Amino acid sequence: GRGLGPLQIWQTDFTLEPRMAPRSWLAVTVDTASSAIVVTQHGRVTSVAAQHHWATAIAVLGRPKAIKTDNGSCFTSKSTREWLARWGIAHTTGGQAMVERANRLLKDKIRVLAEGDGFMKRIPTSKQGELLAKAMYALNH
Amino acid sequence: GRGLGPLQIWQTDFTLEPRMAPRSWLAVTVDTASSAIVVTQHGRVTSVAAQHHWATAIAVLGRPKAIKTDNGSCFTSKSTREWLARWGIAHTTGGQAMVERANRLLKDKIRVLAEGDGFMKRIPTSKQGELLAKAMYALNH
Numbered sequence: 001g002r003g004l005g006p007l008q009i010w011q012t013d014f015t016l017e018p019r020m021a022p023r024s025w026l027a028v029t030v031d032t033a034s035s036a037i038v039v040t041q042h043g044r045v046t047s048v049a050a051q052h053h054w055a056t057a058i059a060v061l062g063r064p065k066a067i068k069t070d071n072g073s074c075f076t077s078k079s080t081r082e083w084l085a086r087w088g089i090a091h092t093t094g095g096q097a098m099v100e101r102a103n104r105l106l107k108d109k110i111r112v113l114a115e116g117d118g119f120m121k122r123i124p125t126s127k128q129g130e131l132l133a134k135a136m137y138a139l140n141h
Numbered sequence: 142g143r144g145l146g147p148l149q150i151w152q153t154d155f156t157l158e159p160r161m162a163p164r165s166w167l168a169v170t171v172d173t174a175s176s177a178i179v180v181t182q183h184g185r186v187t188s189v190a191a192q193h194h195w196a197t198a199i200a201v202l203g204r205p206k207a208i209k210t211d212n213g214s215c216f217t218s219k220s221t222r223e224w225l226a227r228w229g230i231a232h233t234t235g236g237q238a239m240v241e242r243a244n245r246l247l248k249d250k251i252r253v254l255a256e257g258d259g260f261m262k263r264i265p266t267s268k269q270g271e272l273l274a275k276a277m278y279a280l281n282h
Binding site for chain 1: 192193196197199200201203204270271274275277278281282
C-alpha cells in the first residue's frame with residue numbers, strides 16, 4: 001500500500017560509460033520514492049533502447065505513475081511517447097538531480113569493481129553483464 | 142529488517158521455452174519469502190548461464206542467504222559451487238514446488254502475452270526481451 005508514502009515517480013537518463021563498450025550507453029532509472037536504481041546497457045542511444053530499459057525497470061520495480069526525463073530525442077519521439085501511453089505512464093520533461101547523482105554513483109562503482117578485478121581500462125565483454133549487475137546490487141541492497 | 146519474517150531462501154531452476162528461441166532456456170528464481178520471480182533467457186543451459194542469471198537476480202532482489210536447486214550439472218559443477226562461495230551464498234540440492242509453479246505460471250503468461258500480440262508460434266527475436274520482462278512484471282507486481 002502507498003498510503004501517505006512517496007509518489008511513484010521515476011527519473012531516467014542515459015550516461016555514456018566506455019568501460020562498458022561496445023554497449024557503453026547506460027540507461028539509468030532512479031525510483032524517487034525509494035532511491036532504488038535500475039541500469040541496463042545498450043549499444044546505441046535510441047528510442048527503442050529507452051523502451052527496452054523501461055521494460056526491464058517495470059519488471060524490477062513495478063509500473064510507475066510517472067517518469068521524468070530530459071528533452072532528448074530518445075524520450076520525446078513519437079515512438080517513445082506512444083510506448084509510455086501504451087503502459088499508462090505519465091511523462092514529463094519538466095530538475096532530475098537524483099538521476100544525475102545515480103549516474104555518478106554508478107560510474108564510480110563500476111570503476112572500483114572493474115579495477116578490483118584487474119580491469120584498468122575497458123571491461124572484457126564477457127565480464128560486463130555480471131559487473132554491471134554487481135554495481136546495481138552494490139548501490140541498492 | 143527481517144525480524145521474524147521469512148528466511149531469505151531462493152529456489153532456482155531452468156525451464157525450456159521454445160517461444161523464446163534461440164535463447165529458449167529460461168533461468169527462473171523464486172524468492173520463497175515473497176514469492177517474487179526473476180527470469181532471464183539464455184542460449185544454452187550451462188554453469189555460466191546459471192551464474193549470469195543469479196547475478197541479475199541479486200541485482201533485483203538482494204543477496205540471499207541460501208539457494209535451493211536440483212542436482213543438474215549447471216548447479217553442481219565446481220564452477221558454480223565456487224561462484225556461490227564467492228558470494229557467500231549457501232547452496233542446497235535437498236522439494237522445490239515453488240519454482241516448479243513459477244515455471245508453469247511464466248510459460249502460461251508468456252503464451253498469453255505472445256498470442257495477444259499475434260505471435261502464435263515463436264516470438265520474433267526483437268520482441269522477446271520486452272515480452273519476457275512484461276511476463277515477469279505481470280507475475281510480480
